[model samples]
Target chain A: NARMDWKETPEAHVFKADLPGVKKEEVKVEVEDGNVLVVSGERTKEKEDKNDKWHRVERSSGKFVRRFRLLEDAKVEEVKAGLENGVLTVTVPKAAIQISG
Target chain B: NARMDWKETPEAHVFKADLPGVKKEEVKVEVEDGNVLVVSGERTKEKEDKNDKWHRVERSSGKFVRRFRLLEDAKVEEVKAGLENGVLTVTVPKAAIQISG
Candidate 1:
């Protein structure tokens, strides 16, 4: 299991996930039932080759799935996700509250 | 200290180090005394703001250094280093052995 960080901003709820060596297309972000957020991805093994020998193996290879429970303020419909430099950031903007004037 | 992996092939020795959130410019790789290999980098704290409050923190922030002793077969002079997706890889080609036929 990979470690994840959840932070709250004034306008959005943010989720930062570490997914090294994982390609952008492999990552998946979804919101279920409007509150439960999921960020899942699979780390595929390097293509097997006769010339490639492993002298040391530390990088993780396989499926990594992380889930977070978003607060009611999160607007699930407007959630956005981006991956860069192996970090996946998902931002869910807070729903506007009807402030009674 | 960050986790590192060392691998060897018939042609070269390879070193892979994990450095999440570290910019490419921040990493340093050096070879000294022909065999000693050092990789060091520092992670600066995010700019502080009075309005910003951290709800959760897990990513490591600070200095990380790792060293390794290259075998005699490694050609330190022709070594190469690269950073991608927060992973640092240093490759040192093996010295050619002259066979007197």
Candidate 2:
């Protein structure tokens, strides 16, 4: 729903999104059945100034939902996530080689 | 070798990372053979204080790299990337799934 991108690398797959004005605790990320990628979060309420009242506001509020599939080559143990300067970075490592019997 | 997260959804998989203090031009993302995902970038050089010289510098500078694997369900064309407020967001959609005969 929000702006995002998908990146492929020799070591992993990366999903990046811009989530401005989001609190660290409000964000939730989960891997369903070890196959799907789910990122859900909401924007915080606008701050009201005590001294001055806002006549008009340009900021908008809405929900954002992003989904993706995990390839068989991904490395599960190395998955990582963090929020810095209102941006979220989700990194999934490349899958290990599978040996067929 | 940086902070990251790996996520999976019903339709797609996601990879995220935190790269504060990085410029858009300095970062590079590419996919090899339509399987591997790579993100590489370096920190910008700090500006010298003209008014006051720093007796001791605490800020650190270095390089960062990340990798991932794209699942069969990933969508290549819909992936996106952007830089704002010193953060970057990359999104990869689910692959156009196929039902084999």
Candidate 3:
């Protein structure tokens, strides 16, 4: 699992994630069943060199996915996502207000 | 725990870590017992506002520590550390070669 945080503003719900070394093209943001929001990506390991030895290995590589159940008021269709400086931000705006007679 | 990576080359052992949103002043790297290397830091939580709400929370905040045991050949005293763009790299050069009879 990756490090992520989400906070709700009056206009939208903002999601932020720390994804070091992962490129924008490798990240995916999707909405499922009108409510579930999923962020998934792959982090490829660097090519190994015979001359390079690992003294201590800790960074994780390969596929990673994170899912969140959007609230009823979330405008899933209007979700916006962006990646910058290895950080991913996904914004899901709140649905418009309904007026009644 | 934070994500970290380490590799060894003929010249030195290199350690890298991802510490997103953490300031350089907050990170501490140290060597102990002539072999144990430690990296520690804190990711502070943003100030909360009554007008703001959390729809989802996943990012970890607070203190974190990661330690590594350096190899015998490591020149602990000559180790160098640096942080940039939220990534920290520590380099420990190999001990000087000895002359044989």
Number of the top-ranking candidate, with DockQ as the measure? 3
Candidate with best lDDT = 3
Name model 2 segments beyond 4 Å from true: A50-52, A73-77, A96-101, B1-101
DockQ of each: 0.41, 0.04, 0.43
lDDT of 1 by residue, A38-88 (tens): 888786664534576677676655777767777673565588888776677
Give TM-scores of the second chain, every candidate. Answer: 0.86, 0.68, 0.85
lDDT of 1 by residue, B7-83 (tens): 77778878887676678888889987778999998866665555555666676678988888888667777999988
What RMSD value applies to candidate 2? 22.0
TM-score of each prediction: 0.83, 0.44, 0.72
Tens digit per residue, CA lDDT, model 3, B1-101: 78888898888888888877677788899987879999998988886787889866777779999898998768888999987645688898987989999
Model 3 per-residue lDDT tens digits across residues A1-101 = 46788898877788998876676777899888887888998866555557798756777667888888877545655788987645788998886999997
For residues A1-100, what per-residue lDDT tens digits would candidate 2 score against the true structure?
Answer: 2456556555566666656556667677778767777788776653533343232233344677766777753445677988765557788876589999
lDDT of 3: 0.80
| Clash counts for all predictions | 0, 51, 1
Q: Rank the candidates by TM-score, best first.
A: 1, 3, 2
Residue-level lDDT of model 2, residues B1-101, one tens digit each, is: 33454545444454555555566778887776686677888865455344423322323347887777776556766667765544455566775989999
